[PDB]
Design a protein around this ligand. Structure first.
Ligand code: 5SW
Length: 113
């Protein structure tokens, strides 16, 4: 494993703890959510992100954050605001942006000196 992979696995593990039922663990299928693919053109889930870390597909934390935000935005676009999925996506989004804030990344960058 590489330092970036170890860092991204840490961030991913903390985010996945916020989803105990595994609603974001794997892709949303049309069988699980009628007409999902008709609406969501760029799907994302934690499993796809985990596979990207394992394959060394992330060149930056910014790219990892963008995939995470896409996952949450898709749930908030597809599901209405009073649903379990919309609420959980909003919760996960705020938790990830707190964990990977510019302040926290700058402190990590300074510690690499
Ligand atoms: C990855 O699997 C699942 C996804 C969803 C699921 C997720 N997201 C993000 C959605 O937007 C969504 C929207 N509508 C309907 C369903 C979902 C639900 C599941 O069942 C209740 C499973 C099934 N597993 C927990 C075993």
């Amino acid at each position: 494993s590489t330092p970036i992979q170890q860092l991204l696995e840490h961030f991913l593990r903390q985010l996945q703890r916020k989803d105990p039922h595994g609603f974001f663990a794997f892709p949303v299928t049309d069988a699980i959510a009628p007409g999902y693919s008709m609406i969501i053109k760029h799907p994302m889930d934690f499993g796809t992100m985990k596979d990207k870390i394992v394959a060394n597909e992330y060149k930056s934390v910014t790219e990892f954050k963008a995939d995470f935000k896409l996952m949450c935005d898709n749930a908030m676009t597809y599901n209405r605001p009073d649903t379990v999925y919309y609420k959980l996506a909003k919760k996960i989004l705020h938790a990830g942006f707190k964990m990977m804030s510019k302040e926290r990344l700058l402190a990590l960058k300074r510690s690499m000196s």
